């Protein structure tokens, strides 16, 4: 099921070249498979009444656990798997944790996945989010990561799915448009924004309130 989507996903973008800025490309779809198929099995089984939507993995750490917004301590501890996104990983998790308490409860209703699987790095090593990628290049990667965003959507047969910040939710939009589906978005639990650090749990509950699901 989604273990398949996301190996013909790799496939995909297996075939597609990265110019200027990129320096190098990370496919944790490759490199960290077993954790993201553990992932994908054990907590990724149809169906889901709503599908969270996260654009990119974090740097390389983040990227390894084969989990969105995966932190080493949630992966490891909560659901057993063998700095911005380190915060947003806490804020996220420890979150989701707080309402739910185990993992069954959750993923029972919900699944978080991401968006685009690719890592884009610079000369110096930092990390470049595909809506920083030049057009020529950001159209065969949109259109494969929609491809795979519909079949997910098919498949899991969400009533909502919500993007994680405005990147993942305009992203939504475009790759879900004439679905039979409401796209909505909490704020991105990022450090970076001061709105977030104000309380990103209170504000993101809220937003998920006015969307008619309950948390």
């Known amino acids: 099921g989604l273990a398949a989507i996301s190996d013909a996903l790799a496939a995909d973008l297996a075939g597609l070249s990265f110019s200027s800025p990129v320096a190098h490309v990370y496919n944790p779809l490759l490199y960290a498979r077993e954790p993201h198929v553990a992932y994908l099995s054990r907590f990724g089984s149809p169906p889901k009444e709503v599908l969270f939507v996260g654009m990119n993995p974090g740097p390389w750490p983040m990227a390894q656990t084969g989990v969105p917004f995966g932190e080493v301590a949630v992966v490891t501890e909560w659901l057993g798997i063998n700095r911005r996104s380190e915060v947003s990983g806490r804020r996220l998790w420890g979150f989701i944790r707080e309402r739910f308490g185990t993992p069954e409860r959750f993923f029972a209703r919900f699944f978080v996945a991401?968006?685009?699987?690719?890592?884009?790095?610079?000369?110096?090593?930092?990390?470049?989010?595909?809506?920083?990628?030049?057009?020529?290049?950001?159209?065969?990667?949109?259109?494969?990561?929609?491809?795979?965003?519909?079949?997910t959507v098919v498949l899991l047969r969400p009533r909502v799915v919500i993007g994680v910040g405005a990147f993942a939710e305009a992203r939504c939009h475009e790759a879900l448009e004439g679905f039979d589906v409401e796209v909505?978005?909490?704020?991105?639990?990022?450090?970076?924004?001061?709105?977030?650090?104000?309380?990103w749990a209170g504000t993101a509950l809220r937003q998920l309130a006015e969307l008619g699901v309950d948390f």
Do not use: M, V, W
């Not at 909505?184 to 309380?199: F, K, L, M, T």
């Open 184 to 199: 909505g978005r909490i704020i991105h639990p990022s450090p970076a924004s001061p709105a977030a650090n104000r309380d």
């Open 114 to 151: 991401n968006y685009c699987p690719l890592l884009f790095l610079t000369a110096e090593g930092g990390n470049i989010t595909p809506d920083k990628l030049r057009r020529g290049e950001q159209e065969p990667l949109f259109a494969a990561c929609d491809l795979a965003l519909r079949r």
